[PDB]
Design a protein around this ligand. Structure first.
Ligand SMILES: CCNc1ncc2cc(-c3ccc(-c4cncc(C)n4)cc3Cl)c(=O)n(C[C@H]3CC[C@H](N)CC3)c2n1
Length: 295
């Protein structure tokens, strides 16, 4: 529709990004747009800006929904929205910039100890508690969507797949997310809720342990089948984990949605009590950057 486009345009101001921001440097590109780093002229704040051609963009309703969700869900454990501009047919969206890279770089190139894993899980559960208390389900938790500051701060990004629920409609039933990280009830199209994010967090903790989510060697379709049929995945070497870490994982990856922990109750779990300070993550960030120099 041209109606859905006009609705998208209406929630964005018309203006020039260069009035407030400079030193644009392209760090990425794709169909969904070009991504730059840039700087706030008045404050010196480094920012991340996405340039997007609106005409060609499919499923504009998801762009409307992401912008709306960010504007009303600002939090220290989220990669926050700063501003947006319309210029001609292109949309510019300004976000905080995190210079420490993604958690994916860390889990694929380093060995995290349990204190560092507990820290990351805590910060993520803080974001999830905030989101769920505002009836937002992320539905795409994975290390790729966890970004790190150079001080070890931990923030969640990418709200392109999130669902807003209501007491009227408090559950969803559609297969949305990234296969390896999807909870069984999502994969098999049952009525589901916020605890699907708790499952995906459990899979991300398996990333921090083993380097990959379960079945990454398989194609996405085979992985969906395996999740549906196996339920709670198995660790290669559970012997290597503490009793309290194993219990934390079990409570994230519980098949029974009523038995699975909420974000609020996992924030009280004993595993998080051994978390190291976030400064402990900066050597991992340094390692990850070194590892990925050649790409
Ligand atoms: C790793 C470098 N550090 C970093 N720090 C911050 C960001 C912020 C964004 C971003 C997020 C959301 C929006 C958005 C929101 N609402 C509507 C619309 C239309 N857009 C736009 C932007 Cl620019 C972004 O894409 N990346 C790039 C990374 C994203 C995560 C990915 N896995 C790696 C690249 C970022 N990278």
């Amino acid at each position: 529709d041209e109606e859905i486009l006009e609705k998208l345009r209406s929630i964005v101001s018309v203006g020039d990004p260069k009035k407030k921001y400079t030193r644009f440097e392209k760090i990425g590109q794709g169909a969904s747009g070009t991504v730059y780093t840039a700087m706030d002229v008045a404050t010196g704040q480094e920012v991340a800006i996405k340039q997007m051609n609106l005409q060609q963009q499919p499923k504009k309703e998801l762009i409307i929904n992401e912008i709306l969700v960010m504007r009303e869900n600002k939090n220290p454990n989220i990669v926050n929205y700063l501003d947006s501009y319309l210029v001609g047919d292109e949309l510019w969206v300004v976000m905080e910039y995190l210079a420490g890279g993604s958690l994916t770089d860390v889990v694929t190139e380093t060995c995290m100890d349990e204190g560092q894993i507990a820290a990351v899980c805590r910060e993520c559960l803080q974001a999830l508690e905030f989101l769920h208390s505002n009836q937002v389900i992320h539905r795409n938790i994975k290390s790729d969507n966890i970004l790190l500051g150079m001080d070890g701060s931990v923030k969640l990004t990418d709200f392109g797949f999130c669902a807003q629920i209501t007491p009227e409609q408090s559950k969803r039933s559609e297969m949305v997310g990234t296969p390896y990280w999807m909870a069984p009830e999502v994969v098999t199209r049952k009525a589901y809720g916020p605890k699907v994010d708790i499952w995906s967090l459990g899979i991300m903790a398996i990333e921090m342990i083993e380097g990959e989510p379960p079945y990454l060697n398989e194609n996405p379709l085979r992985a969906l089948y395996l999740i549906a049929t196996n339920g709670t995945p198995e660790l290669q070497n559970p012997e290597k984990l503490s009793a309290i870490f194993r219990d934390f994982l079990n409570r994230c990856l519980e098949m029974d949605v009523e038995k699975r922990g909420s974000a609020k109750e996992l924030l009280q779990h004993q595993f998080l009590k051994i978390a190291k300070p976030l400064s402990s993550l900066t050597p991992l960030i340094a390692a990850a950057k070194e590892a990925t120099k050649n790409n």
